[PDB]
Amino acid sequence: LDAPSQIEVKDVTDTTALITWFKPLAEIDGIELTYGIKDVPGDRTTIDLTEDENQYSIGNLKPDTEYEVSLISRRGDMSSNPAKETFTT
């Protein structure tokens, strides 16, 4: 599976951020989005999106903190390779 393309984090405030991407080429059941404070290994929330969703708004983040977001395309048993980006509030 092809990973989501043109992933951009925009509209970042001290506590919120908007993640946007382009839908993968291949048909997929959904996208798994995982985000958390970059250097805290245990801080990882995963959201399962449906194939139709192309953006996700995150709130209640910590100010002046570096975060990492990772996205994977899914289709049954299969998953794409993860694509990751960092952003700072």
Swiss-Prot record:
The protein depicted here goes by the name: Tenascin
Which residue range or ranges hold the Fibronectin type-III domain? 3-89
Q: How does it assemble?
A: Homohexamer; disulfide-linked. A homotrimer may be formed in the triple coiled-coil region and may be stabilized by disulfide rings at both ends. Two of such half-hexabrachions may be disulfide linked within the central globule. Interacts with CSPG4. Interacts (via the 3rd fibronectin type-III domain) with integrin ITGA9:ITGB1.
Expression sites (tissue/organ):
Detected in fibroblasts (at protein level).
Disease tied to this entry: Deafness, autosomal dominant, 56: A form of non-syndromic sensorineural hearing loss. Sensorineural deafness results from damage to the neural receptors of the inner ear, the nerve pathways to the brain, or the area of the brain that receives sound information. DFNA56 is characterized by progressive hearing impairment with postlingual onset.
Q: In which compartments does the protein localize?
A: Secreted, Extracellular space, Extracellular matrix
Tell me its family: Belongs to the tenascin family.
Q: Which domain of life is it from?
A: Eukaryota
Q: What does this protein do?
A: Extracellular matrix protein implicated in guidance of migrating neurons as well as axons during development, synaptic plasticity as well as neuronal regeneration. Promotes neurite outgrowth from cortical neurons grown on a monolayer of astrocytes. Ligand for integrins alpha-8/beta-1, alpha-9/beta-1, alpha-V/beta-3 and alpha-V/beta-6. In tumors, stimulates angiogenesis by elongation, migration and sprouting of endothelial cells.
